[PDB]
Symmetry: C2
Subunit: 292 residues, 2 copies
């Protein structure tokens, strides 16, 4: 079975003053808190048992929003990150949560969208050995881990934030790991910046021949929310799809309902308190519409 | 083989004064003229032989932009629509262009986007009998043809712009027809509004048991450009994907290049005149990037 982890840590001061109010991942993308999207993403890969790592100060705030997840058929747990020592520390912090299980790590500020996303996540979640990551063509690969391919399409190198990228293929912030991830991670020492890097972990799988790098196609939307401009862009986007469709993106209640993790009576009950606004009215409509 | 048709007709005065300047389908969605999207859509379904129907006044303008299509591996032809007698008149006007072949009709102001769009269009283009259309969940099904399904998911009725819709499933403006389409069409008389309706044609296939209605999923983007607000929304959208990816949506040159309809020397030649701007630089980069 596969446990999940959301890294919803500090972005420091780089989005202040917006974020003096609350954590980045509490800020909304259009109509719902940023963290609903990566949560919804782990739910879509069929993952029910999730660890949220954030700062000591923001843990309670996430707790208040999300609880223990039992309202939605989930078991949500929390772990505090004291210092921003890199995202590969997620595995050490999360070491007893993980235990002997498989895992998935997602960034709390990435936004995914597209057709058959459920199936793309299934095929990486389905593999019970090695590691699986997604490469997505971007304008600015310097901002991310960057995968290099040989003429045959096989991954041959990874580099973290290179000043001179080998490709425009960025590694997305959504990752799948077998039971080897903790131990590889424990053998890491901090990078020149002073962080435990996810790229160093993925590289170790690569050298073992156990890294699968699947392409996320250009028909998928991968966005993030690292600047005020891009956050804004992300809101417009979702808003446009939602107002077009009469359907929501990353509605956790709906997803749990479609995963069969809660039933129509439980859904109606979550809808009860929110009946006056468009969101509770949306969850009520899902009881009596067939949506393909 | 399958011929294509683009209906890029009058929107009257309903977008004036923007459109006193030029036809709607000449207006740009972000960086390229509206008509590049439905053109690109027919190209993606593997269609090379295309009839553009527009007003007498706009035919030359389309001609000037697009030519005979031979620059892009296409054979583009033109036919004038004198009066706005409905979109089912496309088949009568287009009757000798169609001849004994299969066909596809697309609206000149619809925007499609998503993963495996190429494969969704292939599976309807592949069928050599009957008709195939796509139903897409929308907020406002009153604006469109609306398909009804039975508990099993089978189409059981179609209605044009109903005041009291049976579902939120709109029939998109992208349609595939066998050789029966002209004759069915010739048996149509104008609706109460005074138009030859596409819904009446699709209904006739439905009653013959020869209408396939495939769902276009919520992971696809279906947008249109009927109002100034929505046009604007469509531009933002495309712009967001393009600036994110460093990739274009509905670049006809690129598509013809990937269809193998033109070669790397022809592409370089189309790039030559546009070298100074971002678009010609984009076509040059496609000569030497591998894009999955
Ligand atoms: C639009 N997407 C989506 C989908 N596709 N669905 C339908 C669904 C729900 C569960 C498993 C497969 C499909 C849904 O109920 N809510 C959604 O937001 S999605 O696959 O692109 C998605 C799913 C979760 C988070 C972000 C996007
Ligand atoms: C993003 N899309 C797209 C794609 N997918 N491609 C790649 C491609 C090109 C030809 C056949 C299959 C895939 C492309 O070269 N240009 C594109 O705009 S698309 O399928 O959503 C599309 C294609 C044509 C018009 C509008 C969207
Ligand atoms: Cl794709
Ligand atoms: Cl879908």
């Amino acid at each position: 079975k596969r446990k999940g982890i959301i890294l919803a840590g500090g972005s420091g001061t780089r989005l202040h003053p917006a974020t003096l109010a609350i954590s980045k991942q509490l800020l909304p993308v259009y109509d719902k808190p940023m963290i609903y999207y990566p949560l919804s993403t782990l739910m879509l890969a069929g993952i029910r048992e999730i660890l949220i790592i954030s700062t000591p100060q923001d843990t309670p705030r996430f707790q208040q929003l999300l609880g223990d997840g039992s309202n939605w058929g989930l078991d949500l747990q929390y772990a505090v990150q004291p210092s921003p020592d890199g995202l590969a520390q997620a595995f050490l912090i999360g070491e007893s949560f993980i235990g002997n299980d498989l895992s998935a790590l997602v960034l709390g500020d990435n936004l995914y969208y597209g057709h058959d996303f459920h199936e793309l996540l299934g095929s990486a979640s389905q593999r019970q050995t090695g590691a699986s990551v997604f490469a997505y063509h971007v304008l600015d690969p310097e901002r991310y881990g960057v995968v290099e391919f040989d003429q045959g399409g096989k991954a041959i190198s990874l580099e973290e934030k290179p000043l001179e990228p080998k490709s425009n293929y960025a590694v997305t912030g959504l990752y799948f790991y077998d039971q080897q991830v903790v131990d590889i991670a424990r053998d890491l020492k901090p990078s020149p910046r002073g962080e435990l890097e996810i790229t160093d972990v993925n590289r170790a799988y690569l050298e073992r021949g156990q890294l699968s790098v699947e392409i996320m196609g250009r028909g998928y939307a991968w966005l993030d929310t690292g600047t005020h401009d891009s956050l804004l862009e992300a809101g417009q986007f979702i808003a446009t799809l939602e107002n077009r469709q009469g359907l929501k993106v990353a509605c956790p209640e709906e997803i749990a309902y479609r995963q069969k993790w809660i039933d129509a009576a439980q859904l109606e009950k979550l809808a009860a308190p929110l009946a006056k606004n468009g969101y509770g009215q949306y969850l009520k409509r899902l009881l009596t519409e067939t949506v393909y």
